[PDB]
Design an enzyme around this catalytic site. Structure first.
Site, PDB file in Angstrom:
ATOM      1  N   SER A 117       0.854  -1.189   0.346  1.00 43.95           N
ATOM      2  CA  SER A 117      -0.126  -0.042   0.115  1.00 43.95           C
ATOM      3  C   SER A 117       1.557   1.375  -0.093  1.00 43.95           C
ATOM      4  O   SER A 117       1.595   1.609  -1.056  1.00 43.95           O
ATOM      5  CB  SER A 117      -0.823   0.097   0.817  1.00 43.95           C
ATOM      6  OG  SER A 117      -2.270   0.281   0.468  1.00 43.95           O
ATOM      7  N   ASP A 141       0.082  -5.926  -2.934  1.00 42.06           N
ATOM      8  CA  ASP A 141      -1.103  -5.595  -3.394  1.00 42.06           C
ATOM      9  C   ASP A 141      -1.193  -4.012  -3.572  1.00 42.06           C
ATOM     10  O   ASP A 141      -2.477  -3.665  -3.054  1.00 42.06           O
ATOM     11  CB  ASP A 141      -2.530  -6.129  -2.275  1.00 42.06           C
ATOM     12  CG  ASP A 141      -3.513  -6.297  -3.099  1.00 42.06           C
ATOM     13  OD1 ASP A 141      -4.732  -5.772  -1.652  1.00 42.06           O
ATOM     14  OD2 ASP A 141      -3.844  -6.391  -3.981  1.00 42.06           O
ATOM     15  N   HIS A 261      -6.148  -7.584   1.880  1.00 41.71           N
ATOM     16  CA  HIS A 261      -5.070  -6.696   1.192  1.00 41.71           C
ATOM     17  C   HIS A 261      -3.715  -7.023   1.722  1.00 41.71           C
ATOM     18  O   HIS A 261      -2.462  -6.518   1.347  1.00 41.71           O
ATOM     19  CB  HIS A 261      -6.155  -5.709   1.311  1.00 41.71           C
ATOM     20  CG  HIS A 261      -5.254  -4.544   1.213  1.00 41.71           C
ATOM     21  ND1 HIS A 261      -5.198  -3.863   0.046  1.00 41.71           N
ATOM     22  CD2 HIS A 261      -4.511  -2.770   1.871  1.00 41.71           C
ATOM     23  CE1 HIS A 261      -4.201  -2.999  -0.222  1.00 41.71           C
ATOM     24  NE2 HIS A 261      -4.058  -2.324   1.149  1.00 41.71           N
TER      25      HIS A 261
END
EC number: 3.1.1.1
Length: 281
Positions: A117, A141, A261
């Site tokens: 992220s 991700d 995630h």
């Protein structure tokens, strides 16, 4: 349960989660203000790990233990033991600007960067503004577009008991092993003097300008490999193709089954395997 507890008390749980046996690695919390990091077994490091928003550098514990390798896991600004700003800017562009001094010092020779992220994108930036530091790159991700989508969608404090922070994050993901969830919350909160507890991370008022970021991707000569949560909708087929299109050396997507995630939380054993393969052996 009162917690004058060392931040490394629970390392053994991490080792078990990673399915690795034997002695635990050397570790110390290290700092060059305005940044805190945990350096690993080092006498190192070969790999830098950048966490995501709401997290801290402890999300990589099991991955780092599982992996044989010496490494630097960094608390991004606004996170864990790193300084907050209260201009609210923990954008990847800002994050890179300040980390770049720090990584020259601590971890001068790190071959690889692993970002999830917010950390993945700041690593993108770091790769462009400092090609010497980023030999090869691993995205967990996240795609510049994929995080912008997230930013858009979610453009829209003291706790009586540790248990109440625990319940709150139980609600986020009831289906998850409490022992793990309790660990993550331990590393992500602290007690005040009031008795009252608080999140170590700041709330994010600002992500960056996502288009300069793509110019950075165009500009990057470091090979990128992406790792996706098989059960994460955060990143799409479209997002991926686009990454490939704009990237100079895209090594492909590994899609991990039964992971959300936060792949390092969900299927670290597999992330370990992927990262291992990326160290060319």
């Amino acid at each position: 349960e009162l917690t004058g507890l060392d931040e490394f008390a629970l390392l053994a749980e991490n080792a078990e989660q990673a399915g690795v046996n034997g002695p635990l690695p050397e570790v110390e919390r290290v700092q060059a203000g305005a940044i805190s990091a945990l350096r690993w077994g080092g006498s190192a490091p070969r790999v830098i790990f950048l966490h995501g928003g709401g997290q801290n550098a402890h999300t990589w514990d099991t991955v780092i233990v599982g992996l044989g390798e010496p490494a630097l896991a960094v608390d991004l600004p606004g996170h864990g033991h790193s300084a907050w700003r209260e201009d609210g800017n923990y954008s990847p562009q800002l994050n890179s600007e300040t980390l770049a001094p720090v990584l020259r010092e601590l971890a001068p020779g790190a071959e690889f960067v692993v970002g999830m992220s917010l950390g993945g994108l700041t690593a993108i930036r770091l790769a462009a503004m400092a090609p010497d530091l980023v030999g090869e790159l691993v995205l967990v991700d996240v795609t510049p577009s994929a995080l912008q989508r997230h930013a858009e969608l979610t453009a829209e404090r003291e706790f009586p008991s540790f248990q109440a922070m625990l319940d709150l994050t139980i609600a986020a993901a009831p289906h998850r092993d409490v022992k793990s969830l309790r660990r993550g919350v331990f590393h992500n909160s602290r007690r005040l003097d009031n008795g009252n507890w608080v999140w170590r991370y700041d709330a994010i008022r600002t992500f960056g300008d996502f288009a300069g970021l793509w110019d950075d991707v165009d500009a990057l000569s470091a090979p990128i490999t992406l790792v996706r949560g098989g059960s994460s909708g955060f990143v799409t087929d479209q997002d991926t193709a686009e990454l490939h299109r704009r990237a100079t050396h895209f090594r492909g997507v590994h899609i991990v089954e039964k992971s959300g995630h936060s792949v390092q939380s969900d299927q670290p054993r597999a992330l370990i395997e992927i990262v291992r393969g990326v160290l060319d052996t």
